[PDB]
């Protein structure tokens, strides 16, 4: 109904496959190399999606790029949690049609706790009965949910944009605004997951040669250049709740 929702529905990325070889045995190396490839492929989609959001061109160019490079983990985790919810009713992690994690794969990836964290998020979409429209608004807000403590190049354009995406989430909600407590709480719950995954992928990149885990070009650069800004505390999520 809003022009806003029209736009979010129209630009929502479609299916992305990982290219995983489902004939080879599950192995840390094969599973994580396919996750890394998936990330690279999804990142192409996230860029094209983000550039198409209402107001996104408002930002300075370096701020457009920064915000994508900080927020892609949260975004992709949130969208994967939704895929899992809608395809397999949260029973397994639907990273892609050719890379669905069962318990066994959760274990083999050496990321079990984190997977459980993500399956939990996924169950939340069920337990809270989140709508497609709430989902799209919430995902758009995650793009604007992590920034350098010292601010962006043009911080005022970012603030205005984030303020308006909050207003939009509020509009598709509008005792009732207990929903807002919960949706904001659910949004916050993405961040600690993303942080754990940021530490995991960082350590994995450092030790990648020794474990034959393959990182694609743009993933290696981003995980070595931007991700450490997060881990070092230079760049931090915006939480709703303290």
């Amino acid at each position: 109904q809003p022009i806003f929702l029209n736009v979010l529905e129209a630009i929502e990325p479609g299916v992305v496959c990982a290219g995983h070889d489902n004939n080879q045995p599950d192995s840390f190396a094969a599973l994580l190399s396919s996750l890394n490839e998936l990330g690279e492929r999804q990142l192409v989609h996230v860029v094209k999606w983000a550039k198409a959001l209402p107001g996104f061109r408002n930002l300075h160019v370096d701020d457009q790029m920064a915000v994508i490079q900080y927020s892609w983990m949260g975004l992709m985790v949130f969208a994967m949690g939704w895929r899992s919810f809608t395809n397999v009713n949260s029973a397994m992690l639907y990273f892609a049609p050719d890379l669905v994690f069962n318990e066994y794969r959760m274990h083999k990836s050496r990321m079990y706790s984190q997977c459980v964290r993500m399956r939990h998020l996924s169950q939340e979409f069920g337990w809270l009965q989140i709508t497609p429209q709430e989902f799209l608004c919430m995902k758009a807000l995650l793009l604007f949910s992590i920034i350098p403590v010292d601010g962006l190049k043009n911080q005022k354009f970012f603030d205005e944009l984030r303020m308006n995406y909050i207003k939009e989430l509020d509009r598709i909600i509008a005792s009732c605004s207990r929903r807002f407590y919960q949706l904001t709480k659910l949004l916050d719950s993405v961040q600690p997951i993303a942080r754990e995954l940021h530490q995991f992928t960082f350590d994995l990149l450092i030790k990648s040669h020794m474990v034959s885990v393959d990182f694609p070009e743009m993933m290696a650069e981003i995980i070595s250049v931007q991700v450490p800004k997060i881990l070092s505390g230079k760049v931090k999520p915006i939480y709703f709740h303290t």
Partner: peptide
């Protein structure tokens, strides 16, 4: 960066 090349 490969990212900035992709972006711009």
């Amino acid at each position: 960066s490969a990212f900035s090349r992709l972006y711009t």
